[PDB]
Amino acid sequence: IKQGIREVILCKDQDGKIGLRLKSIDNGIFVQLVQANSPASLVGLRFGDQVLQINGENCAGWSSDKAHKVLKQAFGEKITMTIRDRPFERTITMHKDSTGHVGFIFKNGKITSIVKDSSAARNGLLTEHNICEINGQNVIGLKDSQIADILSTSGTVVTITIMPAFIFEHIIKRMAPSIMKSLMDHTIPEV
Predict the structure, then answer these.
(1) Can you name one GO molecular function term for this protein?
(2) Triad 128, 134, 136: Cα angle to 5°
(3) Which residues does residue 131 pair with via DSSP β-bridges, in sequence order?
(4) Residues 82, 53 contacting (CB under 8 angstroms)
C-alpha cells in the first residue's frame, strides 16, 4: 500500500468504457469494481482505491451516480484521475509452515479465526477482515475453494491485502456476487 497520492491517465476504449465502477464512502469516492482487460486495469487502478480528483475536479461529497455521470461526460481522449492507494486496506506478509499453512480460517472471503503459533498470529493478522488481494492478485468474488487454491499455489512467502469487513461490506453491496466472481479483475498484473 503506497503512501500518498498518484496521478493516472486513462483513455476510453473503442466502446467508450474505462472499466470502472465507483462508490460513495464517507464523502469520498472509492473503486467498487475494476473490469479485466479494461483501461482502468491497464493503468493500475485497484479495488478500494480512492479517487480524489477527476480531470482536476474534487470528488469530495459526490454521489456514485454523479461520479459515473462525470466520467460518461468526459472527453474520452485523456482522463486524469488523482488516486490515493487503497486507504482502507493493509498488507500483511506471512510465511507458510511445513504443512504449507499460514494459520487462519476464512469464510466467504472473511477471516474468522487465527491459529495459535502460526505465521498469521506472529504477524498480527486480524479476524473480521475481508481478503482483497493475495500477492497483489484481486480475489474478490472468488469462491473460498479458489482462494484456498491460490494460497496453495503461492510459494513460501504470502502477502495478503485485507480490509475491515464493515468497510468491505459497505463498498461492495449494490453489485451481485456473480459479477464480482466473473467481471471483477482477477488477473496477475502485467508488465
Answers:
(1) interleukin-5 receptor binding
(2) 125
(3) 162
(4) yes
CATH architecture group of domain 90-183: Roll (2.30)
The domains of the chain are located at 5-84, 90-183
Tell whether residue 108 is among the known ligand binding residues.
yes
The CATH code belonging to domain 5-84 is 2.30.42.10
Residue 126, phi-psi category: left (phi > 0), alpha (psi -120 to 50), beta (remainder): beta
Resolution (A): 2.0
49 is an annotated ligand-binding site residue: no
108/98 Cα distance (integer angstroms):
26
Q: How was this structure determined?
A: X-ray
Using an 8 Å Cβ cutoff, are 72 and 61 in contact?
no
Are 5-84 and 90-183 the same fold in CATH? yes
Backbone angles phi, psi at 87, to 5 degrees: -70, -25
Distances (CA, A) of 109 to 106, 133, 143, 149, 156: 6, 10, 8, 13, 21
| Grid cell at residue 179 | 459479477
Is the torsion defined by CA of 37, 43, 5, 58 positive or negative? negative
123 marked as part of a ligand binding site: no
Question: Cβ(80)–Cβ(52) under 8 Å?
Answer: no
